[PDB]
């Protein structure tokens, strides 16, 4: 069975997406940043997120594969995404979708 940490704009699984399926593997740790397109992404920001994901899964892991640790990785990835959005590297989508600012409203940095 799968082991996953699924929240908004982060989806970590424990398998390999071959064509759309998941296929639990016990060492792949796929990642699916922002499926619903709450935000608008760039090529540099996605690379930063992938690098953070790698250094978070590789440099700090010798522990079990419980769903607790998967959630613990997803939480750090989402804090990193929120920091990227605060600094302004990315932004909300503004498209005609739901548009509920889940990571905070736009403020003016006083």
């Amino acid at each position: 069975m799968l082991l996953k940490s699924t929240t908004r704009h982060v989806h970590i699984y424990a398998g390999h997406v071959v064509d759309g399926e998941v296929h639990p593997d016990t060492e792949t740790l796929t990642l699916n940043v922002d499926p619903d397109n709450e935000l608008e992404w760039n090529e540099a920001a996605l690379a930063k997120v992938e690098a953070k994901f790698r250094e978070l899964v590789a440099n700090a892991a010798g522990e079990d594969l419980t769903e607790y640790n998967l959630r613990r990785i997803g939480s750090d990835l989402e804090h990193f995404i929120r920091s990227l959005l605060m600094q302004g590297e990315i932004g909300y989508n503004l498209n005609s979708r739901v548009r509920n600012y889940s990571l905070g409203i736009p403020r003016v940095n006083h």
Binding site: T7, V33, P35, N37, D64, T66, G91, I105
Partner: protein, 206 residues
């Protein structure tokens, strides 16, 4: 750092349509869809009961066409009623993603829009479902009067009637997916059958 949490500022402006025939057909596409919402029979806690009161004879959502459905495959509306703990958050996202694409969400009660009375000193409640799924309508209040759930249904119908068949592009999932090998010692699942046939149930240890 000029404006924190900025907006997109997009390009390629709209590519929307104008001819009377296609907008008149969009009228029917959106009328058939909003006046036959089928909610998923999904309750977790207190608010569900008020939702059930909204099913009862005192005032039923049967008018304006709402028939509660059991499986998410036929449901196109999930009225999240109850506090979502961290134990059950992935059990909701699943039920949401396991459900056809022109779908909607209503976060009812305070415990699904901000965390509610559990937004403080609680270590297990998800502080709002807006950080799990794209909510469409929020109605506040510990258990909201079941004629406030119907007000939320009114505000959701007038949002559904807004959609545009020439705009269903903002409805798929982009799937920016990656991969990274790990070394993390898979453990055996500690949740199986074996409750009464367990050997430790039949005789005390010496």
């Amino acid at each position: 750092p000029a404006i924190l949490n900025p907006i997109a500022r997009p390009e390629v402006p709209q590519e929307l349509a104008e001819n009377i025939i296609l907008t008149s057909l969009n009228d029917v596409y959106d009328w058939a869809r909003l006046s036959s919402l089928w909610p998923l029979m999904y309750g977790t806690a207190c608010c569900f009961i008020e939702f059930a009161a909204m099913i009862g004879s005192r005032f039923d959502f049967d008018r304006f066409g709402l028939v509660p459905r059991n499986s998410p495959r036929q449901a196109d509306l999930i009225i999240t009623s109850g506090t979502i703990t961290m134990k059950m958050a992935p059990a909701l996202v699943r039920l949401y993603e396991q459900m056809p694409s022109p779908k909607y969400v209503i976060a009812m009660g305070a415990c699904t829009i901000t965390g509610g009375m559990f937004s403080s000193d609680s270590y297990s409640a998800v502080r709002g479902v807006d950080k799990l799924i794209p909510v469409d309508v929020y109605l506040p209040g510990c258990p909201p009067r079941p004629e406030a759930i119907m007000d939320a249904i009114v505000k959701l119908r007038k949002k559904i009637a807004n959609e545009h068949i020439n705009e269903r592009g903002n409805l798929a999932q982009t799937h920016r997916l990656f991969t990274a090998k790990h070394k993390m010692k898979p453990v055996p699942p500690i949740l199986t059958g074996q409750y009464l046939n367990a050997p430790s149930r039949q005789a005390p240890p010496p």
